[PDB]
Amino acid sequence: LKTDIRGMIWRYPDYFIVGREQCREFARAVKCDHPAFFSEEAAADLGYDALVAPLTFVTILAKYVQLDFFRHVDVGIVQVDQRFVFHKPVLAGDKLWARMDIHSVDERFGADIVVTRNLCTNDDGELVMEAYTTLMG
């Protein structure tokens, strides 16, 4: 492991705005075609007052935080698992605060196994999403 990181909580010192045009480009980049990804009328028809972000969009925020962490703690990679839990829908215009916890550290057969948990909260402090990434050594 090189450095014992178990149970470290890493608060990301910046907020993240889920950007409208960027979402639409991300959506087209992963070949989504649902009109709630692109139109405010279509999203309004489903009850939302902004567009819905592509369901993997917050991977960008998740890795902003992960890289900030590895830049600040030495450990010395393939991603084997990805999990998203949507407690609220994440829309264009949302302001998100990120917090990464070290969920698990192993070293089965060969190299190291770290499970990061990226917590996303909004300006009111309610939980909008959790993202679990499993990295391997």
Partner: protein
């Protein structure tokens, strides 16, 4: 396209199959959009140093595509409550003017009437070989 009615879905129902094309240009676009600029997804010679035949699609790109797939069947991106994927296989994307094709399928694995939730287990293959291990999505229907 509206939110699928819960009362219409039974365990064992199969989703319509959908095939998606992907070319090297898609890989190049995704690199810049996502920030993952790792050259194994766009430089064939780097692919060879680590033992691959050709540049490969980003894992998160193929997962992202699955998200589009699941949302069209559900009928509302806002309704999805979870999406979990294990990455078991690489997806080669040759720079040959055609590229590769990913075929997505799914089966309803569980329902829970108290929450009106459904859970789908998905499979995605390329040239017949599965690219995901555990792969599930859930949503709350109307």
């Amino acid at each position: 396209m509206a939110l699928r009615e819960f009362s219409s879905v039974k365990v064992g129902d199969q989703l319509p199959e959908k095939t998606y094309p992907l070319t090297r240009q898609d890989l190049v676009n995704y690199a810049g959009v996502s920030g993952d600029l790792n050259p194994i997804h766009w430089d064939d010679e780097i692919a060879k140093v680590v033992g691959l035949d050709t540049a490969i699609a980003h894992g998160m790109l193929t997962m992202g595509i699955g998200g589009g797939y699941v949302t069209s069947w559900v009928g509302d991106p806002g309704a999805v409550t979870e999406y979990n994927v294990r990455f078991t296989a690489v997806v080669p994307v040759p720079n040959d003017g055609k590229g590769a094709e990913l075929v997505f399928n799914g089966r309803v694995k569980s329902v829970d009437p108290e929450s009106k939730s459904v859970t789908i287990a998905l499979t995605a293959t390329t040239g017949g070989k599965k690219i995901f291990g555990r792969a599930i999505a859930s949503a709350k229907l109307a």
